[PDB]
């Protein structure tokens, strides 16, 4: 009569969204409401390197040789990450699959995905969100030329020392990385749109208007998952 | 009983450790093993603001005013955070309570803390771990004078531009923060050891040798958490 924990159906999500779209905020919100693991690649890699595990030893080897992480290998890391107890209820993938071979390896590794949730925000707004970023390098204090401006243009509020724009946040780099995002993503969705497998299920594709209040973006997402 | 299981008691942990002690790494590890939420003050504050919540709105105004979040307000923020579904199985508090009034406020709320876990590392090692940090500002590429050196001193590997030390990574500041942490931590331990509260329980204090391999530090922690 104390056996009253019911394991509900797994909620397993691939989250997609451009640099600047604010998908990281939605991921935390989903994680906290549905009680599933937010798995982001950046975190997963660093934690793996720190672990001292064989997986981590092999990864640290690769990265010290200059070679980039293979698709088969990053998905092997994912499979391990999702074997953990905090993934009992499902998970949210944030950063993988980034390519067709990654998605194929997930299928072959037997990882089922229920939803693909894409937070869509207009290119121009995305552009402005990245390119406006400033930083005071010595302290790391952040500003944004539109969303969080300094008292005096291009100067740190505390010290008066000049701000800089990070190298990657220049307009041309943003637009180029933006383009490869949209192309890499469009191929991923059409892959999943024409998904045909005997090892895993066909995920439901969901496209969210991310140009609304945060609480509204969240509800639109919630409404879709429940449908 | 068809796919029904025993409702276990939630585990609630206060995690303590000085800057550079690696507490952040162990928190993630504990989170993943025990399926409890890792709540760090920094993230909690950023999230609450970005939420559009009424509480989040007030918090953003306090901070936009350049004011400090009071002891009472930070616990109100903790109260909202731990009401979420990912906290039903328990949580690990990281960065709160830092003061006695936070611990008292936490206690008035009815939060029962099962364990205090202190990841202890010698001061000489802590200081070294912070002071040897260097960054290339334009890229954000980071290095460590000992643990991950650049190929040429004070120079970024990729571009060759100079590296800097962040201002708070200076030895004078590092020592000062170390001294504060140890003092506040002593007070905290003392508070919970002499715990004579009517509303919440007496936590089990666990001190951990954090100067070991990550996997060994975790297993020591598990060992203590798993004791009957
Ligand atoms: Ca959980």
Swiss-Prot record, chain A:
Keyword Nucleotidyltransferase belongs to the record: no
Gene Ontology CC annotations of this record: cytoplasm
Enzyme nomenclature, EC number: 2.7.4.3
Ranges for region LID: 132-169
UniProt: AMP binding residues: 41, 46, 67-69, 102, 166, 177
Annotated ATP binding sites: 20-25, 133, 142-143, 212
Any one Gene Ontology BP term: AMP salvage
This protein's UniProt keywords: ATP-binding, Cytoplasm, Kinase, Nucleotide biosynthesis, Nucleotide-binding, Transferase
Location of region: NMP: 40-69
Coiled-coil regions listed: none
The protein's annotated pathway: Purine metabolism; AMP biosynthesis via salvage pathway; AMP from ADP: step 1/1
Reactions listed under catalytic activity: AMP + ATP = 2 ADP
Its job: Catalyzes the reversible transfer of the terminal phosphate group between ATP and AMP. Plays an important role in cellular energy homeostasis and in adenine nucleotide metabolism.
Protein name (Swiss-Prot/TrEMBL): Adenylate kinase
Gene responsible for this protein: adk
């Amino acid at each position: 009569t104390e056996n009253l924990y019911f394991q509900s159906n797994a909620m397993r999500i691939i989250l997609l969204g451009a640099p600047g779209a604010g998908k990281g905020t939605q991921a935390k919100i989903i994680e906290q409401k549905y009680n599933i693991a937010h798995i982001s690649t950046g975190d997963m890699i660093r934690e793996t390197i720190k672990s001292g595990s064989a997986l981590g030893q092999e990864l640290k080897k690769v990265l010290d040789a200059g070679e980039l992480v293979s698709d088969e290998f990053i998905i092997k890391i994912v499979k391990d990450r999702i074997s953990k107890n905090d993934c009992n209820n499902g998970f949210l993938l944030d950063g993988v699959p980034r390519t067709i071979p990654q998605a194929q390896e997930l299928d072959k590794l037997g990882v089922n995905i229920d939803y693909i949730v894409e937070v869509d925000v207009a290119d121009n707004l995305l552009i402005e969100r990245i390119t406006g970023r400033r930083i005071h390098p010595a302290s790391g204090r952040t500003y944004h030329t539109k969303f969080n401006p300094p008292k005096v243009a291009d100067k740190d509020d505390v010290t008066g020392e000049p701000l800089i724009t990070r190298t990657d946040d220049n307009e041309d780099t943003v637009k180029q990385r933006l383009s490869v995002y949209h192309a890499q993503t469009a191929k991923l969705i059409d892959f999943y749109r024409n998904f045909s497998s005997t090892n895993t299920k066909i995920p439901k594709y969901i496209k969210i208007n991310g140009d609304q209040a945060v609480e509204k973006v969240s509800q639109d997402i919630f409404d879709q998952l429940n449908k």
